[PDB]
Amino acid sequence: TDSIVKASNWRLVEVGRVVLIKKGQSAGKLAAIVEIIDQKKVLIDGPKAGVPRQAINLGQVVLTPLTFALPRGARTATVSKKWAAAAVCEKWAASSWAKKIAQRERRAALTDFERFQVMVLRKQKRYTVKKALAKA
């Protein structure tokens, strides 16, 4: 009896939006949108990760679902204070996205002996899982 309209909630370019830099000197660090310059440009600040305050093209970053309360134009000290208060780093570390990034880094860091151990443990887990699947 009520209207139904699909939302399609996008991540929004906004002050306090957390972004992940994918290419550049940062290339994998988190920053916060400090202000919006243009449809394609924002001023960001990533002081916790070591990202310098900079005007960056939105094509160089990917918006994360994380937002925190930050006033428009806040300087580096204020950005750091509000970032630490909102615990953005922990909220990102809890996400599957950062967990997937860490998993890819760990797999890339595996040695040959560790890959052999991975195969052995995968065979053990596969034996157990196949037995459970056949019992089910």
């Binding site: 991540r11 929004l12 370019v13 002050v15 440009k41 001023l43 305050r53 005007a55 918006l63």
Partner: protein, 172 residues
């Protein structure tokens, strides 16, 4: 011409026995290097005063850095440019963090919209608009509204591989 820097260039109109210590004229020149900065300085000095490079000298060239390179500003830019059939003065507004970035955007925009090459453009003035509601161009005024948020629909992620196995999505 390239990624721009701003230089102060001060020149002299070399002293004689009758006129020692001439009037030491100064300009703010946007150029990619000091050779081009000095060339542009002499070009405009020849447009303004009775002097040339042979009859003058460069007393000082100093790069001027942005005072607050990490503060978002609205710039008003007065330019003069030659079209295919005349000369015109235009006023434009650019949102950026530095004069050099605003000037680079201005040159790109003039080339894109009026086919105005670098040689055809004179930068009359670049000044920060201190107070909003003195911003007179809607394409900049729309970025000054309180709590401005906008999405980025239809995200196109670049593939590192020729073939994809997933029929990707443009959500964001």
């Amino acid at each position: 011409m390239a990624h721009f820097k701003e230089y102060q260039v001060i020149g002299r109109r070399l002293p004689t026995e009758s006129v020692p210590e001439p009037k030491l004229f100064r300009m703010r020149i946007f150029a990619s290097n000091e050779v081009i900065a000095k060339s542009r300085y002499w070009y405009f000095l020849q447009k303004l005063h009775k002097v040339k490079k042979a009859s003058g000298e460069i007393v000082s060239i100093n790069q001027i850095n942005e005072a607050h390179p990490t503060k978002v500003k609205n710039f008003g830019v007065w330019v003069r440019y030659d079209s295919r059939s005349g000369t015109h003065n235009m006023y434009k507004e650019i949102r950026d963090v530095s004069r050099v970035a605003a000037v680079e955007t201005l040159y790109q925009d003039m080339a894109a919209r009026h086919r105005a090459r670098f040689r055809s453009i004179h930068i009359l003035k670049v000044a920060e608009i201190e107070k909003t509601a003195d911003v007179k161009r809607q394409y900049v005024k729309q970025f000054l509204t309180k709590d401005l948020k906008f999405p980025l629909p239809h995200r196109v992620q670049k593939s590192t591989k020729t073939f994809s196995y997933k029929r990707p999505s443009t959500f964001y």
